[PDB]
């Protein structure tokens, strides 16, 4: 494609503690981030103001989620409960809806399947599917070999992949709840999980600089995007709406961008004085966001 | 621009709240509490009450402490502790009453060396080697009711000394405090525990104060 280095249009200040969570809604205009000061903050790259700042019951929150209709937000963390907050309330302020308890494992990824279902995955080697109406695990995903902390959904809302940091990369199903596909062959624990916009590809990001992608239909290792001289790890990974761009967040105080087939660096997002732990691209495909541990959020457009 | 100005002013109002909330968080001191299986990590938290991470709050000499337990959480400890970087003091609790066991019921290691395999690991990972590692010596009272019985030679073969509290106490520091390959920045605050006295929380305040002072001294090239 080219050497698109970086473009820091704006910087979202205000955060004070480290950030391990960042998600974008379907409107391509709102951003949600979490921090260790017990203050979950919703942003928007169009105006750069704090639209909502809902305090967090657990300061150790490590994940975020935005509802497709922009009406709910979720948090996880080392507290084992998913505190669902309804943004649209008659009282106006953001309040908790239901606390999803019964995990007994650290929480680091709970994506919003829809306005009613949650695909909360915990660190007790088991995932779960939640229901807002009853607040109970509709499905009891089990069969992993290690703790899983990063998931990614699909536009059709009919499939998701749960990848633990033990070269598991198990592909589950929303309804039947069994491992339909499994990918193995990774040499290190994984920490970043993403899904293709088309819904027929799946990539992982591990703590070995070996960001690789696989295929849903055929279980084999595609291009591994071999690093040149990078020895650090990867914390977050995301796919642009174009589908011909790979973006990953590395531990060496910077980010790198590759191509679908070139598998070569196409730009460095080094603008943060700490390791990057968040990454996300808008559903439309305009502008990119990055969260890190220096309590600074920036938008790359 | 009436709504845009109000929306912009809303962020400024929230920013003021963040500064007020951040100021309280800034002066609040974070405490990491950890231990082995029934190693006295639950006995300490019951001391400073009147005066899967659980969190307890107490005030001692204009300081807002906050413990973050680990016994109730069972996961890959060595890879989620990165979130605890920046914690001022890490309280490690080991009871001097379990230096023997029939294997480990999960591996081949007594509790004493297993605890020493966690104290060394927690002070060697590249996340906590900046401030200090506070150590607590639990089961101090019951230690005497086992030192005149079967000695420390069961756990420590190289033990060569007397069979009293004075000789034993000096050894305990060597077993735990001398577990740092780096001593330029990290320090171990070894001090015993009182079963029914308030001196346990007194050691918390000054030790946390000492590392706080050294943290400022270490910065700006003054220590």
């Amino acid at each position, epitope marked *: 494609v080219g050497r698109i280095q970086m473009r820091t249009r704006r910087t979202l200040r205000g955060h004070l503690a480290k950030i391990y969570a960042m998600h974008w809604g379907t409107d391509s*205009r*709102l951003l949600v981030s979490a921090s260790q000061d017990g203050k979950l903050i919703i942003w*928007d790259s*169009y*105006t750069t*103001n704090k*639209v*909502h700042a809902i305090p967090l019951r657990s300061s150790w929150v490590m994940t975020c989620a935005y509802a497709p209709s*922009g009406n709910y937000v979720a948090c996880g963390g080392l507290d084992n409960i998913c505190s669902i907050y309804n943004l649209k309330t*008659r*009282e*106006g*302020n953001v309040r908790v809806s239901r606390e999803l308890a019964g995990h007994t494992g650290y929480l680091s990824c709970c994506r919003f399947l829809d306005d009613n279902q949650i695909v909360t995955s915990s660190g007790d080697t088991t995932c779960a599917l939640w229901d807002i109406e009853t607040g109970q695990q509709t499905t009891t995903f089990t069969g992993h070999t290690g703790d899983v902390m990063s998931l990614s959904l699909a536009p059709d809302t009919r499939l998701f992949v749960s990848g633990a940091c033990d070269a598991s990369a198990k592909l589950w199903d929303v309804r039947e709840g069994m491992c339909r596909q499994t990918f193995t062959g990774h040499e290190s624990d994984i920490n970043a999980i993403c899904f293709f916009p088309n819904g027929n590809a799946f990539a992982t990001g591990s703590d070995d600089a070996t960001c690789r992608l696989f295929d849903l239909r055929a279980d084999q290792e595609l291009m591994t995007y071999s690093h040149d001289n990078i020895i650090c790890g990867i914390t977050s990974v995301s796919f642009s709406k174009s589908g011909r761009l790979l973006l990953a967040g590395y531990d060496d105080f910077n980010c790198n961008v590759w191509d679908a087939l070139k598998a070569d660096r196409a730009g460095v997002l080094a603008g943060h004085d700490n390791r990057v732990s968040c990454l996300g691209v808008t559903d439309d495909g305009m502008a990119v966001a990055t969260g890190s541990w220096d309590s600074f959020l920036k938008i790359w457009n | *621009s*009436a*709504e*845009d*100005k*109000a*929306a912009v*002013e*809303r962020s*400024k*109002m929230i920013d003021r709240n963040l500064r007020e909330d951040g100021e309280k968080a800034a002066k609040e001191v974070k405490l990491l509490l950890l231990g082995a299986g029934e190693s006295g990590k639950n006995t300490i938290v019951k001391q400073m009450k009147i005066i899967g991470i659980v969190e307890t709050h107490f005030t001692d000499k204009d300081l807002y402490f906050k413990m973050f337990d680990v016994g109730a959480q069972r996961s890959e400890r060595k890879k989620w502790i990165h979130c605890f970087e920046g914690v001022t003091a890490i309280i490690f609790c080991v009871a001097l009453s379990d230096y023997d066991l029939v294997l480990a019921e999960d591996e081949e290691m007594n509790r004493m060396h297993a605890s020493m395999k966690l104290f060394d690991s927690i002070c060697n990972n590249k996340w906590f080697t900046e401030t200090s590692i506070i150590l607590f010596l639990n089961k101090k009272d019951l230690f005497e009711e086992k030192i005149k019985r079967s000695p420390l030679t069961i756990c420590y073969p190289e033990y060569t000394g007397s069979n009293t509290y004075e000789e034993a106490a000096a050894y305990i520091q060597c077993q735990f405090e001398d577990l740092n390959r780096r001593k330029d920045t990290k320090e171990i605050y070894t001090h015993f525990t009182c079963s029914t006295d308030t001196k346990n929380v007194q050691f918390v305040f000054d030790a946390v104060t000492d590392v706080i002072i050294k943290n400022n001294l270490k910065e700006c090239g003054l220590y």
Partner: single-chain antibody
Amino acid sequence: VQLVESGGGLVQPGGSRKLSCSASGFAFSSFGMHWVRQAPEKGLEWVAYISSGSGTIYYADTVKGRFTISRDDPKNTLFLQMTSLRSEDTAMYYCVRSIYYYGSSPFDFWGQGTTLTVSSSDIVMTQATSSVPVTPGESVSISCRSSKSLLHSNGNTYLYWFLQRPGQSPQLLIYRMSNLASGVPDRFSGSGSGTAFTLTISRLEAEDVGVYYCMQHLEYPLTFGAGTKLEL
């Protein structure tokens, strides 16, 4: 969640009387408070506005020292501090709840208000064709004027749509950019290119008789329709 007006009214001619509406069941801390005033026969017009934290003290074009606003946020209530009297004060004062952010719906819930009888640049936006006597099922259409464009370069039109049942507080139908608000039922819509807006309600039914408003929100001075007179 429930606002009712009290404090007095019609105490004596020529005597100042400050009034305040009681509020309940919401934060109010992050909520804008308006004092939009209704004419004795037809027309609900805005005179005061305060935002969160009392930062914004926007007043109406009829600027006077007697018109003041005070945010009773600690009490969740509000203050007016009326001074002197005038023939224009014979009116119907209401209370307004509003919040300002992306995706928000300002002017959602309005109180019942009270009647205050007194004895001895702007879009204006008045519904010119406010007389169409039609039976239910006729797909009523109401058109409001606009002096200039209401799009402040943000891609959305800062126009609010209302519905006032007889003897009841006004209810907003669709907020800016022609989107549903306040949880009101469906079939409430309407939009236009520029400086020309229309009402599109199909599958017409009852419980919609009264007066309709057309509000602009481009800048500090707000305005509404003089009055719509469409009945069954």
